[PDB]
Design a protein around this nucleic acid. Structure first.
Ligand code: NA
Ligand code: NA
Ligand code: NA
Length: 326
DNA sequence: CATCTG
DNA sequence: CAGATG
C-alpha cells in the first residue's frame, strides 16, 4: 500500500475520536482524509503535499510531517498507553457496549472484563450476553461449521413451511473459508412490500430454531429482524461448540433477490455493479432495481424473480457468488 | 435501518 | 421520546 503508513495512522486517530473522544466531526475528518489519501497515486513526501488534497488540512498535514520525519506519532503513542483509552477500547469489544456505554463504565471505575462480571447488574440483557460469550464472539466460524449451521437452519425452516425461502449470505455464500457470523435472509410469498408486516412469519422460524435448541439467546427480535445467538449440538462427553452470532432478516418476496445480492457482496462488487447499472440507466439498491431517467427520475421497481434477473436488466453475464470478489 | 432502554 | 447499538 503506497501510503499505508499514513492511512493507518489516520484510521487509528479516527477510531480514537469515535470510541474515546466521541467527537463525530474529527472522526469524520480523519476518515475522509484516509479515504482521499488512499486514492492518491503518489508516495506522499510531506504534509504540504498531502494538504493539497481535499479533506486534508493544517492539523492532518502536521501529523503527516511528524510521521514521515520520525516514523511515529507521539499522540498515538500516548493514546496506546493511556489507561482510560485502552479500557474503553477493551469494553467496546463486548457486543452491546458502544462508545457511550464504555465511557459510562470506565467513569464508574469499570475497566476490565472481570470488572464487568462483578458488575453484571449494571449491564442490560444484550451486554450480559455479549460478556458471557465474549471469547466465542471474537472467534471465526470455520466454513465446515457454517455448513452444519446452514443444514440446521434450512431444514428447520422448511419444516415450518415449505414455502419459506432461506439463504445464508455474506462471505460464506462467496465460498469464504471462515465467517464472522451467520446472516440469514428469509422470505415468504405471502409477504410483499405493500402489505402489512406479518409478525408471525419471522417469529415462527425463530421459535422452531429455539425448539430444537439451535438458537440459545435473543439480543433483539421484531417483525422483520432477529439478532441472537446459536450453537451447534454436541454428543454427551464431547466438548461443546462455541456460541455464534446469528441474524435473521425477513424481507418482502418482491425485494428478496435484491436483498440477497446486496448482503452477499462483496462491498467492492456491489460498488462496481451499482456503477455499471447507472451507466445502463438503472439504479440498484438493497431493495429494488429501478430504471433511471435522464432527468434523474427513478422509475417504479422492476419485477425481480432471481439474482439473474438483475444481471439481465443491466446486460451483465450472471456472476456466481464465488466470482463476486469485485 | 430495526430494535432496545429508561 | 432521544440516544444508543449492531
Ligand atoms: Na461493542
Ligand atoms: Na474451531
Ligand atoms: Na441528534
Amino acid at each position: 500500500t503506497l501510503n499505508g503508513g499514513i492511512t493507518d495512522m489516520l484510521t487509528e486517530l479516527a477510531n480514537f475520536e469515535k470510541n474515546v473522544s466521541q467527537a463525530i466531526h474529527k472522526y469524520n475528518a480523519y476518515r475522509k482524509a484516509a479515504s482521499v489519501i488512499a486514492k492518491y497515486p503518489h508516495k506522499i513526501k510531506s504534509g504540504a503535499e498531502a494538504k493539497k488534497l481535499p479533506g486534508v488540512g493544517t492539523k492532518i498535514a502536521e501529523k503527516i510531517d511528524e510521521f514521515l520525519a520520525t516514523g511515529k506519532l507521539r499522540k498515538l503513542e500516548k493514546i496506546r498507553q493511556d489507561d482510560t483509552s485502552s479500557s474503553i477500547n477493551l469494553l467496546t469489544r463486548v457486543s452491546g457496549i458502544g462508545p457511550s456505554a464504555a465511557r459510562k463504565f470506565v467513569d464508574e471505575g469499570i475497566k476490565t472484563l472481570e470488572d464487568l462480571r462483578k458488575n453484571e447488574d449494571k449491564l442490560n440483557h444484550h451486554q450480559r450476553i455479549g460478556l458471557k460469550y465474549f471469547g466465542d464472539f471474537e472467534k471465526r466460524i470455520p466454513r465446515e461449521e457454517m455448513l452444519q449451521m446452514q443444514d440446521i437452519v434450512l431444514n428447520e425452516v422448511k419444516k415450518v413451511d415449505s414455502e419459506y425461502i432461506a439463504t445464508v449470505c455474506g462471505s460464506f455464500r462467496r465460498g469464504a473459508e471462515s465467517s464472522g457470523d451467520m446472516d440469514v435472509l428469509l422470505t415468504h410469498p405471502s409477504f410483499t412490500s405493500e402489505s402489512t408486516k406479518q409478525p408471525k412469519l419471522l417469529h415462527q422460524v425463530v421459535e422452531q430454531l429455539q425448539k430444537v435448541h439451535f438458537i440459545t439467546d435473543t439480543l433483539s427480535k421484531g417483525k422483520t429482524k432477529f439478532m441472537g445467538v446459536c450453537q451447534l449440538p454436541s454428543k454427551n462427553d464431547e466438548k461443546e461448540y462455541p456460541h455464534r452470532r446469528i441474524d435473521i432478516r425477513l424481507i418482502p418476496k418482491d425485494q428478496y433477490y435484491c436483498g440477497m445480492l446486496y448482503f452477499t457482496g462483496s462491498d467492492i462488487f456491489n460498488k462496481n455493479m451499482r456503477a455499471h447499472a447507472l451507466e445502463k440507466g438503472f439504479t440498484i439498491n438493497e431493495y429494488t432495481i429501478r430504471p433511471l431517467g435522464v432527468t434523474g427520475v427513478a422509475g417504479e421497481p422492476l419485477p425481480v424473480d432471481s439474482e439473474k434477473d438483475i444481471f439481465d436488466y443491466i446486460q451483465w453475464k450472471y456472476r456466481e457468488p464465488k466470482d463476486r470478489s469485485e
